[PDB]
Design a protein around this ligand. Structure first.
Ligand SMILES: CC(=O)N[C@@H]1[C@@H](O[C@@H]2O[C@@H](C)[C@@H](O)[C@@H](O)[C@@H]2O)[C@H](O[C@@H]2O[C@H](CO)[C@H](O)[C@H](O)[C@H]2O[C@@H]2O[C@@H](C)[C@@H](O)[C@@H](O)[C@@H]2O)[C@@H](CO)O[C@H]1O
Ligand SMILES: [Ca+2]
Ligand code: NI
Length: 142
């Protein structure tokens, strides 16, 4: 995959915002996973919490990398979730499910050359906030 993180600085949004956890903190170019360092997002405790970045145009995506929150012993809030790729009309072009990160600070998701404008993370769990230290997105090679 290419090395340019194309998610950086792009428009981000999420299902709701709590504890000041702006959606843009996931694309601010800082993977620091301590919530107190202000670079981790946070939605409400709600069902099917989601976060999304708009790449701004359609890109051939090969890799999406999630960085989990690392403080407060609440890492397992990022579990039972999908990573979704949508085209410009916001239809799904790819979707992968994950049970867990297994205590890892990060997850690399590889997509098979998918042409997508939006990258979404969706929890499938009830009454759980979504918190991401960073989401990085990389174009397929060549
Ligand atoms: C007091 C205040 O100004 N805000 C509190 C939160 O505390 C702030 O954010 C934390 C991440 C720390 O950086 C802390 O120093 C800072 O004041 C508070 O969060 C909890 O704070 C406690 C006690 O210090 C622990 O750090 C705990 O891990 C924090 O709770 C977690 O993070 C929250 C943001 C939520 O995700 C909670 O569900 C987690 O358990 C919160 C909650 O008590 O209240 C703010 O308004
Ligand atoms: Ca960040
Ligand atoms: Ni600190």
């Amino acid at each position: 995959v290419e090395t340019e993180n194309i998610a950086r600085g792009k428009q981000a949004s999420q299902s709701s915002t709590a504890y000041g956890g702006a959606a843009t903190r996931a694309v601010d170019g800082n993977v620091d996973s301590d919530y107190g360092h202000h670079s981790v997002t946070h939605t409400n405790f709600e069902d099917n919490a989601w976060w999304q970045v708009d790449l701004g145009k359609t890109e051939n995506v090969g890799k999406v990398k999630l960085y989990n929150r690392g403080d407060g012993n609440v890492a397992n809030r990022l579990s039972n979730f999908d990573v979704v790729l949508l085209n410009e009309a916001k239809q799904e072009v790819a979707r992968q499910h994950f049970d867990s990160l297994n205590g890892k600070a990060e997850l690399e998701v590889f997509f098979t050359a998918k042409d997508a404008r939006y990258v979404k993370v969706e929890l499938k769990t009830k009454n759980t906030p979504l918190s991401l230290a960073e989401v990085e997105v990389f174009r397929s090679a060549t």
